[PDB]
Design a protein around this ligand. Sequence first.
Ligand SMILES: C#Cc1csc2c(=O)n(CC)c(NC3CCCC3)nc12
Ligand SMILES: [Mg+2]
Ligand SMILES: [Zn+2]
Length: 318
Amino acid sequence: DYNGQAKCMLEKVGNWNFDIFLFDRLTNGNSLVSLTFHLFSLHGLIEYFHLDMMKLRRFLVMIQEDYHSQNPYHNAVHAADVTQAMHCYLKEPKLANSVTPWDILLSLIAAATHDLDHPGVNQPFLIKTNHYLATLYKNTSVLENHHWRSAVGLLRESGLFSHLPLESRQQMETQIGALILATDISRQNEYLSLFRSHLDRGDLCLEDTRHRHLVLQMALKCADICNPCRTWELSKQWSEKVTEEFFHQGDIEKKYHLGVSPLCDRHTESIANIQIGFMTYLVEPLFTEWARFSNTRLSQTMLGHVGLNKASWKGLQR
Ligand SMILES: C#Cc1csc2c(=O)n(CC)c(NC3CCCC3)nc12
Ligand SMILES: [Mg+2]
Ligand SMILES: [Zn+2]
């Protein structure tokens, strides 16, 4: 049954209401490997790039296993969710009609690896505790640079692309980095303003790689914060997990006199209030610009869920 139903759910991997939680329970925690493998084969990538399936499984397992499963939110199930969303966005017509197999490959790798080896605490925390990552990356997109360099390390170690030219391997590394770095939420204003100006001007040319990669970066940013655009029953699980992780960082800050970060204080802060502010100020602006770019049923469905989920959180107030 368990392998039966898993295989079965993957028939609906293009669906916005895909249930990654059930999927991960069904696979005893193998959701990122098993979904991503399926997508490589669905998008034809194993053939297009002459991939060794043994090396691909090894690669995917190294990724999945380098997530910290004890993180309430930043674990391989979140990676798998982001990868599944990225897949839905790659199916939108303006992307499906311009992306090459190389773009699809880099998008799905970047989605799978984008929070790799995440410690479960944020950049301000690592900076104020003098963590070696904050030094190494000079206080700038500390976590994203760490996920990216960790991804590069796994790419090199797996040999998966060893039969491609060195210059293609290097280019793969660099374009994945630009995708992962776009997920630094502290810089969403720079990405969103540039994207919005391109949409005002109407100047995007998707047959140009640079414009297409700007859009893929915005797609990955959507994938990363699309939790509130899911159905209530998914979004509520994501909200409890993210809050659980923030609040744990809060307890450490409190216990050790570090200063409690915004959003991490379980005594003065609420799950509903945290979601509401986030939806108003980060989610709705990004998804409104996304819907201008890709003005489709999926974009409407996603914005409908934000409005409904936001009303549910208000409802659970007074
Ligand atoms: C600031 C803030 C947030 C308040 S609620 C909330 C949330 O539910 N998520 C999950 C979508 C993220 N994702 C962020 C974490 C860092 C990158 C994306 N950020 C926040
Ligand atoms: Mg991240
Ligand atoms: Zn993420």
